[PDB]
Amino acid sequence: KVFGRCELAAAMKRHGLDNYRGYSLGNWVCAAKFESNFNTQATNRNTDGSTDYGILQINSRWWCNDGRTPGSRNLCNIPCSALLSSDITASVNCAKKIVSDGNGMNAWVAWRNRCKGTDVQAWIRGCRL
Ligand SMILES: [Cl-]
Ligand SMILES: [Cl-]
Ligand SMILES: [Cl-]
Ligand SMILES: [Cl-]
Ligand code: NA
Ligand SMILES: [Pt+2]
Ligand SMILES: [Pt+2]
Structure with missing residues (x-):
């Protein structure tokens, strides 16, 4: 699913x-915008062989199981495919663990570099919330 800006907010x-x-809502909407352009089905392969999945580009090295990332963990206890759903629950639930892990939203490189x-x-401006 490709969310609208205020829809995702x-x-x-x-x-x-x-x-x-x-982290205020605007930070999370920005991070989604630059990680996935708001597309739940976004995937990106990393050179290390892990893949990032979903609206917040959650990585299989730590956080989910995709069966093809040797040596990795599954700290959200989900198949990575769950991160691709039109329903954002698994992504958000997993992102709450990620942002609790010590480095805050610096875990999302696009958030650090762009948000x-x-x-x-600005990302939530004008949205009924
Ligand atoms: Cl936008
Ligand atoms: Cl905000
Ligand atoms: Cl694996
Ligand atoms: Cl923090
Ligand atoms: Na994994
Ligand atoms: Pt809704
Ligand atoms: Pt929820």
Whole structure:
């Protein structure tokens, strides 16, 4: 599913991301925008052989099982395919563990390079929330 901007902002707010670990909703909407362009079915293979999945590009090295990432963990206890659903629950639930892990939203490289320190409020501006 390709979410609209305000559509994803509502879904992410419903699922408790607004100010989750201190990160305002705009940060999560931005991170989705640059990780996946809001497409739940986004996948990207990494040179190390892991794959990133879903709206927040969650990596199989740590967080999910795809059966093809040797040596990896599955800390969200889900098949990576669950991260591709039109329903964002598995992605958000897994992202809450990721952002709790020590480095906050720096775990999402696109967030650090493109969202951090910017006017992230713009991403939710105008949305009924
Ligand atoms: Cl947009
Ligand atoms: Cl915000
Ligand atoms: Cl694996
Ligand atoms: Cl933090
Ligand atoms: Na894995
Ligand atoms: Pt909804
Ligand atoms: Pt939820």
